[PDB]
Amino acid sequence: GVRTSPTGEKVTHTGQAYDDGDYRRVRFSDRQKEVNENFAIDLIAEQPVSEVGSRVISCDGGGGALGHPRVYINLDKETKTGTCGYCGLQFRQPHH
Amino acid sequence: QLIAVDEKLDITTLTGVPEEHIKTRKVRIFVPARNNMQSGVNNTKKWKMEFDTRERWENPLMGWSSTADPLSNLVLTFSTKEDAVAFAEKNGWSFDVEERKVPKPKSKSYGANFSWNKRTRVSTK
Amino acid sequence: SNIVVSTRTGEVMRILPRMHEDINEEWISDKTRFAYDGLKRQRLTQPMIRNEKGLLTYTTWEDALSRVAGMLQSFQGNDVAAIAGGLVDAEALVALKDLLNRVDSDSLCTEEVFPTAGAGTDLRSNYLLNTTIAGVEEADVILLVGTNPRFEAPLFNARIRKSWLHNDLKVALIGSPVDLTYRYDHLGDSPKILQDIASGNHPFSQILKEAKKPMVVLGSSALQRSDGTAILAAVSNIAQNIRLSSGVTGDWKVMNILHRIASQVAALDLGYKPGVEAIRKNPPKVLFLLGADGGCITRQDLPKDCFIIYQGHHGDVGAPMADVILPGAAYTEKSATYVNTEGRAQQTKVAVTPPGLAREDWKIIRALSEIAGMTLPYDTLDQVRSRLEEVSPNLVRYDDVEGANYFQQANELSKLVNQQLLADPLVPPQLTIKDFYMTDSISRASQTMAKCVKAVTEGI
Amino acid sequence: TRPTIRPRNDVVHKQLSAFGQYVAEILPKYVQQVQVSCFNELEIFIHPDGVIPVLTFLRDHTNAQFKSLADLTAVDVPTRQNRFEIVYNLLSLRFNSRIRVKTYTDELTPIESSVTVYKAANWYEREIWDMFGVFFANHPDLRRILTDYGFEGHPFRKDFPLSGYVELRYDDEVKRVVAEPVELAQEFRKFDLNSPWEAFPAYRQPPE
Amino acid sequence: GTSVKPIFSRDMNEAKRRVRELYRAWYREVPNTVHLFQLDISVKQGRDKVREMFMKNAHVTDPRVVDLLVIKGKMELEETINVWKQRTHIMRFFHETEAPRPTDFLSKFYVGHDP
Amino acid sequence: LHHALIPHGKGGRSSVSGIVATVFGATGFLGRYVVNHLGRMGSQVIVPYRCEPYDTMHLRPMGDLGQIIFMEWNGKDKDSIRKVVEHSNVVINLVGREWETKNFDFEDVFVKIPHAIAQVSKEAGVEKLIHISHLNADIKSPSRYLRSKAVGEKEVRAAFPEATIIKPSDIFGREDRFLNYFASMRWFGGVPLISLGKETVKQPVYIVDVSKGIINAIKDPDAKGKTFAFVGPNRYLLFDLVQYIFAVAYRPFLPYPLPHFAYRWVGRLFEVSPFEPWTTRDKVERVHMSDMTLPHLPGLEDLGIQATPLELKAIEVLRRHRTYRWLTSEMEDVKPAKTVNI
Amino acid sequence: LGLREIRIHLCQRSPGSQGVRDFIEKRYVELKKANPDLPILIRECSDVQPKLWARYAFGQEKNVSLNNFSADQVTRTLENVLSGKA
Ligand SMILES: NC(=O)C1=CN([C@@H]2O[C@H](COP(=O)(O)OP(=O)(O)OC[C@H]3O[C@@H](n4cnc5c(N)ncnc54)[C@H](OP(=O)(O)O)[C@@H]3O)[C@@H](O)[C@H]2O)C=CC1
Ligand SMILES: [Zn+2]
């Protein structure tokens, strides 16, 4: 989700962009500013929420030993989804 | 035989240190305070000598932190305050000494949690 | 409170408590812990002057210093004045005092008001917490007058609660019924009660008479009304009756004054005039604002075309009204002396350097003095502290709290002025928690304190 | 206790203790202490004045025959009145053994050169002079060995900064390499690593 | 007594004699250094620089420190005579590319925070 | 003052000086010294170059990482100048050529290019412009080179009113065309001098003094629209100066008088070279012309610089021109020449 | 010439300050009632010596040692400072 700035400079996913008065912009003349186009926040927001039939679920990021340390997530709050602290995947219990 | 010098120990002319980093520096001799996030006391046993903080500025190219003083990372360990004072004096550095802070002994009583008439009785466990 | 400042790569990261058994001993208040955020915004980084259109414009140190020096050489005496704010250090205070003394000016004032009749600032014990913070653990009765110790001095209130819990301490309050997190006896809120305890016509006078280790604490915030002198005289009369009926218990120092401003005690030690009344009576033509952001004096109280100079670290009440802005250093950016409400002198250490073109405050004053022709003798920090020792030698003893007691002389000098009390209840400035988070320039710029205010005013 | 723990040898411990007692008995004028570490290393702490005799004894004695000087270096401990610790490591090929000899000095006290006993000492002492500033008397040719020509200071001292005081570059105005005060684009970042909890109870010090 | 042992000199007189011998050697050597290293300075400049270095440690009152300083000076002279030093090493005494720094309070206040 | 441009550090290689300077003509004689002085204290330097990048390599070690940026430019293209001055707060113009090429003449390099640089810098918002002219610039000067200098300084003043103009006189140094030019005349055996060089007075100035003066003018708030004259401390008759140059180089001096028209003919003959000419008619005229005295203009001393005499710096230039026999001779041997001072 | 402030630095339990202490215990108050608009700052010294500081117009000030003085001596010197002499 790359947007442009008033000077035309591309904005990074961390939100960095030189101001108009900033002289450091001169380093991009006759060259380019390296920006990664795959914003992880939007990509993780695109993932669907899993529904499970237990109060506690377990997440390891997928791939077993190729994922992250395995953690357990509580799903007692009905008006909220449980989020993995490593992966960002979301889990919930069936409602309504 | 011996010559019996009657002067004060002074080795500044032999250490190679520039004059500016001798006369304009203030060293601090202290026992470091316990980190309040932990209960361990093993880091509050020795005396430390450290130098006064100088300027740091952002690097233009990568925004890193840049310094111009060479003593910004120098920390010395000593067994006693007198040893640190002697080292600082013989190296020509002017110093500030802070006395050691030791927690005072406390009177603990588990029974006081259930006092018949005092305010120390706990409402929960 | 003793603290540890955590910094990384030239940036202040967090504030942690540092153990001092006599002062805070493991804790800090929430403002002390979370107000570091404020220092990162609304900061003064460059000198500023007024352009052709009356707008503030960046300029070099030389230009601003030259303008201030010319304006200072123009005038003399009562036409020059200064106001010291709540976060000023002793070194800058003594430097500014010497600079204005070279002009033969004595209008060196603080925003916080202390009564000047009788002994005034001549005797230190007149304006100190003589029992000390540790001494609260030895008292059996403490009388609180016109104060809210919970928010004015949270760690002092914590010590009071410790004594209440472990020593069965008896606490009585005169003022509005605030919540102090411990049970106390509420005598009332009218100041007449003070006289009733001074005349012996109150049961609590009897209670104080049988108290072998009594304490009476009067808040500085209660001395801000017009009848502060009479209130201080009444409290002194109560302490007199305690000392006379109960005799002398050795060295107990019943009389006590609780301060809320970090710079007040050092300024009183150096001879600053408490209050801003001298400025009102003789409106100056050149005014120095040394971190003064209490809005005590605006441009309505001053004549037109008055030259106002602000020296500080934050853009707040004081900066937009100034003709020249001199960016100074914050307390995390200098080694500076601060004196306790106990009277204990302590020093800060440099954690990070001042941002932009900001400089050490005493260095700014010394450079200005050299530009203006009246060069101050001291050139380094050690020489400024030697000057401090010259003016008040207790400012260089960096953990000492013991001092002489002159209660008899101050009490005798306090009973020759018989001004009357006011029929207004004693109301502390901070009545609830929401008035706690934002009190000074740094905490007003903090986003965390704003979040705390929003959270306490509405739960959600 | 078996698989992960290093086994100990008691025969070598006994033999090294006996030889330490032997050396201490023969040379009471200079030997201040004798120790045997629990991984079977023998050290002898001596007065500085006995650097030449003791070493000579160890080199030429029929029962010692430590004829190889493996290493000679210094250790800097600022908290001591005598700052510098001089360490000799000797090897006996006849008896297949190793021994360590230790002494002390400060900044202004010379130590006698041991080049007459071991030729190998010649460069080692030079290194000690270059890195720590310890002067050796009667050295045939004592001068810097490791540092740049004209270098000021002794970099292996604890109070010497890691990056030093000067840095080099090429200047085109003078058309030569020049030295200037150190300026670092990224300051070296000091890490505070020690745990606040004690690790080894067997080494606990009395609370004074 | 303080029970200290000497390096070479017994008191300050012998130390001063060694200092004078070292100064004589350096003074004699300066013109040869100017010739061999092809320096653009004059012989007077080199001798003034030699004089300046000696004056810097003039204050020292301990014979052991003076002895060590003389040893270091002899080492430096040996480095110079044998052309172990290069032209850059000799010219490092003159700090030709270092911009001058003012010692006045105002100049330091203007540039930065350093005292 | 734009926080990112607030000076920081100690004034060394990794410090921030607060200067963003675009230096036109930075690949020449004065350019290398100017760039080195800017990079010593941690300035951001922008180098517009038209030559082969191999010929800019010697400027790369003069700055910390990221502090020297190289960009192509065309002297006849306004957009190149715009691109290379869009972000600078200081523009320095050191563009010049001693001879005329088939594609650029004196009017192109001393009038049109400086005028374009000044106009585009003024439009871009550059606040400081330094323009280098000649001390002998005159509208009625016989030399083509001097007349274009005067016209160009007038046009630069018109386009950028707050510009600082600096007029040096015969800069000498390791890569100069003044001491090297006279030393190289030994290859013809004798030195031809118009009127034996007895009616020409020179006041040469050291290169490092000029570079330091440019730096101090950049850092001087009072030097905005001022015109300076950078000259050396002594004035010499041309004969005496050339005699001293040959004495420092330990070469035999054989001066002989050549008539003006014959020397003009020799300059014509040498102008035909498609490479850098050994000499030109304009060059001959400049060499024989006396240096002007302009006491009403400020000088190097007004910028805190004590002018370096030629007697202390001639050996560092002329030692290269000696034979093996005289290579080790010290600087105080060659009996400094006489000066016509006051 | 115009007195602005008086500063008395006396030590808490040093013998040499005793007389000065006595003065403050006996005859400070009267002085305060004689000069009710004059700053008389009483502060404490470290182990060195007693001292009296007198500050005048335009930042001029001088100090007089009160070491081993009795109360009469300190009263004499104080009224000498307050009057137009010395
Ligand atoms: N040296 C002296 O005696 C004194 C010099 N003068 C003035 O000082 C300035 C610099 O002097 P100096 O260093 O000796 O001259 P140089 O010959 O050494 O270099 C001049 C610079 O201008 C550039 N340049 C020249 N022509 C053009 C062009 N047509 N287009 C683009 N760039 C060009 C050159 O780049 P490139 O390498 O690509 O050709 C070169 O970088 C000049 O303006 C000169 O007039 C002032 C008094 C005398
Ligand atoms: Zn996961």
- Domain map (residue ranges) of chain G: 1-86
For chain F, the 3-state helix, strand and coil shares in percent, each to the nearest 5, are 40, 15, 45
How far is the C-alpha of B88 from the C-alpha of B47, rounded, in Å?
13
Ligand 1 pocket residue status of F168, Cβ below 6 Å:
yes
Contact C261, C86 (CB under 8 A): yes
Ligand 1 pocket residue status of F28, Cβ below 6 Å:
yes
- Copy the structure tokens of residue D160: 């010497």
* Amino acid letter, C381: L
Chain C environment of B37 (Cβ under 8 Å): 16
Interacting residues of A12 by C-beta distance below 8 A, sequence separation 6+: A35, A36
Contact D117, D90 (CB under 8 A): no
Where do the H-state alpha helices sit in chain G? Answer: 18-26, 28-34, 71-82
Smallest CA–CA distance, residue C309 to chain F, in Å, is 21
* Minimum CA distance residue for ligand 1 atom 24: F95
Smallest CA–CA distance, residue F311 to chain D, in Å, is 17
How far is the C-alpha of E112 from the C-alpha of G4, rounded, in Å?
37
Contact C29, C153 (CB under 8 A): no
Tell me the three-class secondary structure of C402-431, residue by residue.
CCCCCHHHHHHHHCCCCCCCCCCCCCCCCC
Interface size, chain E vs chain F, as Cβ–Cβ contacts under 8 Å:
31
Tell me the three-class secondary structure of C241-282, residue by residue.
HHHHHCCCCCCCCCEEEECCCCCHHHHHHHCCECCCHHHHHC
Residue D101: which of D109, D111, D110 has the closest Cα? D111
Output the known binding site of F: 25, 27, 29-30, 50, 95-97, 145, 149
User: Which residue in C354, C367, C380 is closest to E109 by CB distance?
Assistant: C367
Interacting residues of D5 by C-beta distance below 8 A, sequence separation 6+: none
Contact F193, F256 (CB under 8 A): yes
Whether F88 and A23 lie within 8 Å, measured CB to CB: yes
How far is the C-alpha of C274 from the C-alpha of F160, rounded, in Å?
57
Q: What are phi and psi of G61, to 5 degrees?
A: -155, 150
Chain F environment of E42 (Cβ under 8 Å): 330-332
Atom of ligand 1 nearest to the CA of F172: 3
Q: What are phi and psi of F272, to 5 degrees?
A: -80, -5
Reduce the DSSP state of residue F162 to 3 states and report it.
coil
Residue C136 carries which DSSP code?
T
CA D102 to chain centre: 8
Number of domains making up chain E? 1
Ligand 1 pocket residue status of F25, Cβ below 6 Å:
yes
Tell how strand C48-50 and strand G3-9 pair up.
Answer: unpaired
The boundaries of the domain holding residue B89 are 19-113
* Minimum CA distance residue for ligand 1 atom 6: F134
Residues 99-138 of D with CB under 8 A from B: 107-108, 133
How far is the C-alpha of C44 from the C-alpha of C326, rounded, in Å?
8
- Sign of torsion over alpha carbons D109, D112, D118, D120: positive
Indicate the helix (H) or strand (E) that contains E72. helix E63-81
Q: Which of F58, F94, F111 to mutate to test the pocket of ligand 1 (most atoms within 8 A of CB)?
A: F94
Any idea which residue has 């409400």 for tokens? C341
Where do the H-state alpha helices sit in F171-206? Answer: 179-183
Q: Of how many residues is chain A composed?
A: 96
What torsion, rounded to 10 degrees, do the Cα atoms F42, F48, F51, F57 define?
20
CA angle in degrees (0–180, nearest 5) for C327-C330-C332: 145
Does B105 reside within a domain? yes
Contact G8, G39 (CB under 8 A): no
Whether D178 contacts chain E with CB within 8 A = yes
How far is the C-alpha of C124 from the C-alpha of C115, rounded, in Å?
13
Number of domains making up chain B? 1
Indicate the helix (H) or strand (E) that contains F316. helix F315-318
User: Which residue in F7, F41, F332 is closest to E42 by CB distance?
Assistant: F332
Return the partners of chain C (3 or more C-beta pairs < 8 Å). B, E, F, G
Chain B environment of F14 (Cβ under 8 Å): 59, 66, 68
User: Which residue in B17, B73, B87 is closest to D153 by CB distance?
Assistant: B17
Residues of F with CB under 8 A from a CB of C: 1, 3, 6, 221
End-to-end CA distance of chain C: 33
Q: Do chains D and A touch (3 or more CB pairs under 8 A)?
A: no
Interacting residues of C426 by C-beta distance below 8 A, sequence separation 6+: C145, C146, C174, C175, C176, C189, C190, C191, C222
Closest Cα in chain F to E31: F330
Ligand 1 pocket residue status of F134, Cβ below 6 Å:
yes
Reduce the DSSP state of residue G42 to 3 states and report it.
strand
User: Angle formed by the axes of helices G18-26 and G71-82, to 10°?
Assistant: 70
Contact C338, C348 (CB under 8 A): yes
Indicate the helix (H) or strand (E) that contains C188. strand C185-188
Ligand 1 pocket residue status of F51, Cβ below 6 Å:
yes
- Copy the structure tokens of residue G84: 């137009």
- Copy the structure tokens of residue F17: 């000086």
Interacting residues of E48 by C-beta distance below 8 A, sequence separation 6+: none
- Sign of torsion over alpha carbons F264, F267, F269, F271: negative
Give residue numbers after which chain C breaks (C–N above 2.5 Å): none
Residue C309: which of C274, C380, C361, C258 has the closest Cα? C361
How far is the C-alpha of E2 from the C-alpha of B89, rounded, in Å?
18
How far is the C-alpha of F143 from the C-alpha of F147, rounded, in Å?
7
Ligand 1 pocket residue status of F75, Cβ below 6 Å:
yes
Interacting residues of D41 by C-beta distance below 8 A, sequence separation 6+: D16, D98, D100
- Copy the structure tokens of residue G28: 């400070």
Whether D150 contacts chain E with CB within 8 A = yes
Interacting residues of B99 by C-beta distance below 8 A, sequence separation 6+: C399
Exposure string of C229-254, with b = 16+ CB inside 10 Å and e = fewer, is: bbbbbbbbbbbbbbbeebeeeeebbb
- Copy the structure tokens of residue F6: 């607030």
- How many CB atoms neighbour CB C386 within 10 A? 13
Interacting residues of F116 by C-beta distance below 8 A, sequence separation 6+: F75, F78, F81
Ligand 1 pocket residue status of F171, Cβ below 6 Å:
yes
- Copy the structure tokens of residue C81: 């004045």
Q: What are phi and psi of G29, to 5 degrees?
A: -55, -50
Fold type of domain A40-92: HSP40/DNAj peptide-binding domain (2.60.260)
Smallest CA–CA distance, residue E62 to chain D, in Å, is 10
Residue C147: which of C174, C116, C185, C109 has the closest Cα? C174
Indicate the helix (H) or strand (E) that contains F217. helix F207-218
Chain E environment of D173 (Cβ under 8 Å): 97
Residue B87: which of D81, D133, D109, D132 has the closest Cα? D81
Ligand nearest to the CA of A82: 2
What is the CATH classification number for the domain harbouring B69?
A: 3.30.160.190
How far is the C-alpha of F137 from the C-alpha of F150, rounded, in Å?
5
Any idea which residue has 């760690």 for tokens? C155
